[PDB]
Write a protein that binds this ligand. Structure first.
Ligand SMILES: O=c1[nH]c(=O)n([C@H]2C[C@H](O)[C@@H](CO)O2)cc1/C=C/Br
Ligand SMILES: O=c1[nH]c(=O)n([C@H]2C[C@H](O)[C@@H](CO)O2)cc1/C=C/Br
Lengths: 304, 309
């Protein structure tokens, strides 16, 4: 069976992810952000909706709970194209290519399902607009990590990123620096959690508070009072959700892209990170054509 | 190599599903209750009361269509949470199908299945106007992979006996809405058909234009018919590719399930016995370790203790 190489460009927004990633593509397909689904298809102006709710809450115009139903609902719309894409792609993915020949196909996904199912929801809770239980519901629904999941997260100084973000302002966005901090922190903890997990870290054994300290992983976010029994013990439901987060993240292949550089530079770098990524076999002869079409139809229909 | 028997009893509420689940376990077996405590306090405060109140305000016209959808969707996420985590932890303990084959080492009787929270109630709420079809399809896209030996028992009870039954008991927060009752009844009815249609070779794509335990049903009698929504249709008339991909998943998820029908129009013990009879010819699965049984047993035990009653 021929091999496929899937790469998921992810990280905080405003770092130049999309720009540099189309820049290297345009055997290689680029799956963009489902902007059309966000703005029109699934609902109208989801982005605007998200940034507006926060602001009304920020300004005391709504309660933390109103911001939460809207926020939760919006996050459902946000990752819908990602959930179906993973779901349909899942059967075609086989085991890792002996890592391997040039892959018969390279998919450049602009973000992975975890952004909408884990990262953004976490950021919003850190922003006071999502319940830690809603977040934990998103985690529980995270699809099993298919082999060959290479996530490229980005690295960029804060003030440089604020400069860059001043422009990557999706339709109806608000330059919220606290959200930028929250999301940077969330993607930071995540890079740390993957390592902690890959280095043998056990959240249940470390809960009591080489490899990162549990206090520097996503597990810290869930020491939320809402998640605890009157005796301080995490409820089992929530603990089982942390077990899921743990097995979904431990098999993901993480790579870092320093965005503090020129477009051709960021782009070159990304082409560099490619040599250590895990590729896989497709399950059928028709997998490559069918995957290629999938990717081209997503772009065509939802890219904006 | 031990074998496990999983049985999810599902269907519209108010049919007596839980008494009969419990009676059956009173006759080894382990019962996994509805996570009423998660819905009342752990995940959110009075989630069921919220659902019935939100639809009401929508109905009364106090809240607006989208105001309700935003509440219904968040309420549906909370309702399904315990179901989705329990499924995710179970998954790696489930091995190949064995059949019903000798007595299983462990028998798990679940009150409802993940699709109740991620498909049925949401599809029912869509029909009630309190949810959008895009969102229902969003949930559908997140329906976890169907593990082998996924035996689902749906109930059958006459519309009238059901209404009376509903009319007698009292859920906390629930409100007698026979419009939702009919909605939930039709939805579980399309589900039953859907499984059979898929198991009879149907391809919703082949038959989209047309919109065993019996013959193959007409696509219009399956759940695919709820998605002929204008908002899911492109200008050219067909469904946008996102939504059609969601329906492919729905097909994949339900075609490997083993669905059974239990008639609830009999005494509690009658139902107890009718279900004990369907159970005999239900597909078992091996576990992935002898020690998966103890584990599985305890997971079920803790779930009950923590979220039941
Ligand atoms: O879950 C999400 N939620 C969210 O708030 N965003 C924001 C970031 C930026 O404002 C704009 C474009 O990424 O939308 C992205 C996603 C991505 C999901 Br895949
Ligand atoms: O998704 C759901 N949503 C919903 O409205 N309910 C209602 C039914 C009844 O009124 C009450 C108890 O099941 O809650 C059940 C479920 C259970 C899903 Br698992």
């Amino acid at each position: 069976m021929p091999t496929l190489l899937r790469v998921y460009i992810d990280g905080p927004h405003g770092m130049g992810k999309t720009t540099t990633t189309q820049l290297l593509v345009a055997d290689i397909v680029y799956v963009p952000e489902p902007m059309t689904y966000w703005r029109v298809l699934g609902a109208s102006e989801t982005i605007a909706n998200i940034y507006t709710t926060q602001h009304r809450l920020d300004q005391g115009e709504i309660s933390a709970g109103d911001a939460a139903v809207v926020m939760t609902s919006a996050q459902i719309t946000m990752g819908m194209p990602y959930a179906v894409t993973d779901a349909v792609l899942a059967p075609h993915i086989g085991g890792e290519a002996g890592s391997a020949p040039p892959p018969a196909l390279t998919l450049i996904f602009d973000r992975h399902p975890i952004a909408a199912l884990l990262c953004y929801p976490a950021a919003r809770y850190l922003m006071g607009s999502m319940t830690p239980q809603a977040v934990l519901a998103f985690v529980a629904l995270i699809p099993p990590t298919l082999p060959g999941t290479n996530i490229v997260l980005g690295a960029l100084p804060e003030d440089r990123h604020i400069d860059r973000l001043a422009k990557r302002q999706r339709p109806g966005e608000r330059l919220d620096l606290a959200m930028l901090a929250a999301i940077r922190r969330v993607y930071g903890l995540l890079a740390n959690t993957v390592r902690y997990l890959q280095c043998g870290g056990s959240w249940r054994e470390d809960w009591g508070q080489p490899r990162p300290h549990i206090g520097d992983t996503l597990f810290t976010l869930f020491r939320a009072p809402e998640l605890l029994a009157p005796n301080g013990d995490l409820y089992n439901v929530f603990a089982w959700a942390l077990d899921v987060l743990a097995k979904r993240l431990r098999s993901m292949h993480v790579f870092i892209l320093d965005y503090d550089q020129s477009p051709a530079g960021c782009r070159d770098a990304l082409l560099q990170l490619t040599s250590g990524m895990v590729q896989t076999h497709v399950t059928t002869p028709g997998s490559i054509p069918t995957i290629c079409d999938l990717a081209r139809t997503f772009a065509r229909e939802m890219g904006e």
